[PDB]
Design brief:
This is part of a larger assembly, with chains A (about 90 residues) and B (about 55 residues). With about 90 residues, chain A is an all-alpha fold. In chain A, about 85% of the residues lie in helices and about 0% in strands. In chain A, α4 packs antiparallel against α6. Chain B is mostly helical and about 55 residues long. Chain B is rod-shaped and about 55 Å long. Classes of the chains: A mainly alpha (about 90), B mainly alpha (about 55). The interface between A and B is small, with 7 and 8 residues.
Chain lengths: ~90, ~55
């Protein structure tokens, strides 16, 4: 969070978050939300692992954030892949 | 643009038009094809070269 408040730093923070998610549903959703808000090879690998890893409380959290989820996540992943390809 | 300029000048030369009309039209096509390829690479297809299609 401190790093977030403070580009490379942001990437390091995102990586840390992905690592935490791997170690651990709600957390995963929060992570996806953060990634969408932000929207190379290591990053792609992480995104992939997350997709591989991918109830009511989670849905509620998702609804609060929006104020379907899986689809949005897939879309974000596709966008990231496109970005990596362009790079 | 250089080719468009050369072809035009070639069409109004004293003594008769230039013989290289189609030779230049071919070069135009090749140049456009290369600008297309380069534009695709620059536009993202270069960062996605190691990916399966």
């Amino acid at each position: 969070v401190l790093s977030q408040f403070y580009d490379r730093e942001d990437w390091g923070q995102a990586l840390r978050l992905l690592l935490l998610l791997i170690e651990f549903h709600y957390l995963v959703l929060l992570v996806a939300k953060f990634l969408y808000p932000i929207f190379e090879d290591s990053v792609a690998t992480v995104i992939e692992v997350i997709e591989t890893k991918w109830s009511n409380l989670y849905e509620t959290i998702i609804e609060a954030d929006k104020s379907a989820t899986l689809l949005k996540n897939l879309r974000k992943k596709l966008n990231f892949k496109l970005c990596q390809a362009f790079m | 643009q250089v080719l468009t300029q050369i072809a035009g000048t070639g069409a109004t030369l004293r003594g008769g038009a230039a013989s290289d009309a189609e030779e230049i039209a071919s070069l135009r096509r090749t140049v456009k094809g290369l600008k297309r390829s380069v534009d695709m690479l620059l536009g993202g297809e270069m960062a996605r070269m190691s990916f399966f299609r």
